[PDB]
A paper describes a structure:
Here we elucidate the molecular basis of high-affinity phosphite and hypophosphite acquisition by determining the ligand-binding affinity and structure of the PBPs of phosphite and hypophosphite [name] transporters from environmental microorganisms. We over-produced and purified PBPs of three putative phosphite transporters; [name] from the globally important marine diazotroph Trichodesmium erythraeum IMS101 (Te_[name]), PhnD from the oceanic picocyanobacteria [name] MIT9301 (Pm_PhnD)35 and [name] from the soil bacterium Pseudomonas stutzeri WM88 (Ps_[name]), as well as a PBP from a putative hypophosphite transporter, HtxB, also from P. stutzeri WM88 (HtxB)18. The structures reveal that ligand specificity, measured here by thermophoresis, arises from a combination of steric considerations and the interaction between a ligand P-H hydrogen atom and an aromatic π system in the binding pocket. The structures of two distinct types of phosphite-binding protein and a hypophosphite-binding protein reveal that a P-H…π interaction ensures high-affinity binding of specific ligands, representing a universal mechanism in these PBPs for recognising ligands with a P-H bond.
To try to explain this, we determined the structure of the Pm_[name]/phosphite complex, which shows that Pm_[name] has the same overall fold as Te_[name], with complete conservation of the amino acids that coordinate the ligand, including the P-H…π interaction with Y206. We calculated the volume of the binding pocket in Pm_[name] and found that it is 23–29% larger than those of the phosphite-specific PBPs. Comparison of the Pm_[name] binding pocket with that of Te_[name] (RMSD cα: 0.75 Å) and Pm_PhnD (RMSD cα: 1.52 Å) shows that this expansion is due to Ile20, which is conserved in Pm_PhnD (Ile11) and a leucine (Leu20) in Te_[name], as it adopts a different rotamer that forms a small hydrophobic cavity next to the capping tyrosine that is absent in the other proteins. This seems to be due to several sequence changes in the second shell of amino acids within lobe 1 that create space for the Ile to rotate. We were unable to measure the dissociation constant of Pm_[name] for P-ligands here as the protein showed evidence of aggregation in the MST assay. Thus, from the structural similarities with Te_[name] we can speculate that Pm_[name] is most likely specific for phosphite, however, due to the extra space in the binding pocket could also bind simple phosphonates, in agreement with the previously reported ITC binding data. The unknown substrate of the Prochlorococcus PhnYZ system, encoded downstream of the ptxABCD genes, may also be a ligand of Pm_[name]. Therefore, some Prochlorococcus ecotypes appear to have two independent phosphite transporter systems, and may also be able to take up some simple phosphonate species.
Numbering used by the authors: 9 to 272
């Protein structure tokens, strides 16, 4: 297990498993030839199942969300090493959205609604949107009710068809879904965009040999292929460290997030 013939490679389920698996097929191939190893992709049922797999050393690489990374890191020996970069920027934003037809175009209009959230351990579809609503005088459980719909796709669709009159999701996923014709820009209004969040970290199991780790780090950081990178809307991968995610630790402490809800 310090240098196995097969690498288990886990991907956070931020969208439908089918989409996540298809988008990563280019990378799967590249890594297979770069390493001379069998590559198995895993897409779990939710973010917490992925944290528990990290915890029991079942993963070798793991593409986490920022909050899910901070959670897994506390109970696992994984370590960060790369993140997507695009026109010099290594960050993304959370979007607050509203149902256009019902006139939900401002924070005041969220009062008395169902507000759509993603997975409970999501950075841009749970943590950041709840903080943002609170900073505009709306407290969950008294001014509105949240509902956990599991993924960012599901949040976007719920707001568009009015099952929820507002919600919170990652801005790159919203942009992607409009490009594909899934989300109609006339039906969903962007009410706000948060400050920058650090990108999703690629991580690796810590008990892998020094030589393999450097090879993994190099391969990602040196990567330049359009087959691999085009489904990601990225120019490459840039280096990152654990302290890039202290902002996220601060935000989670402030909201009152509970590691025991997500692990054990």
């Amino acid at each position: 297990s310090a240098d196995p013939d097969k690498l288990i490679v886990a991907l956070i389920p931020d969208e439908n498993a089918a989409t996540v698996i298809q988008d990563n097929q280019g990378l799967k191939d590249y890594l297979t030839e770069a390493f001379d190893k069998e590559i198995e992709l895993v897409v779990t049922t939710d973010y917490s199942s992925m944290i528990e797999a990290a915890r029991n050393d079942r993963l070798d690489l793991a593409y986490f969300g920022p909050l899910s990374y901070v959670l897994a890191k506390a109970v696992s020996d994984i370590e960060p090493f790369a993140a997507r970069i695009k026109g010099g920027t290594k960050t993304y934003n959370s979007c607050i959205i509203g149902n256009t037809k019902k006139g939900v175009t401002s924070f005041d209009d969220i009062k008395g609604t169902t507000f759509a959230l993603g997975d409970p351990a999501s950075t841009s579809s749970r943590l950041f949107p709840e903080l943002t609503l609170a900073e505009n005088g709306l407290t969950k459980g008294k001014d509105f009710q949240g509902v956990f719909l599991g993924s960012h796709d599901a949040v976007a669709l719920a707001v568009q068809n009015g099952n929820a009159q507002a919600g919170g999701m990652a801005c790159p996923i919203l942009k992607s879904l409009k490009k594909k014709g899934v989300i109609d820009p006339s039906k969903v209004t962007t009410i706000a965009q948060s400050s920058p969040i650090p990108q999703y970290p690629w991580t690796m199991r810590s008990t892998l040999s020094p030589e393999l780790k450097e090879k993994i780090r190099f391969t990602f950081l040196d990567l330049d292929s359009d087959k691999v990178l085009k489904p990601f809307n990225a120019d490459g991968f840039a280096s990152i460290t654990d302290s890039d995610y202290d902002g996220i630790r601060k935000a989670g402490k402030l909201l009152g997030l509970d590691l025991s809800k997500f692990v054990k």
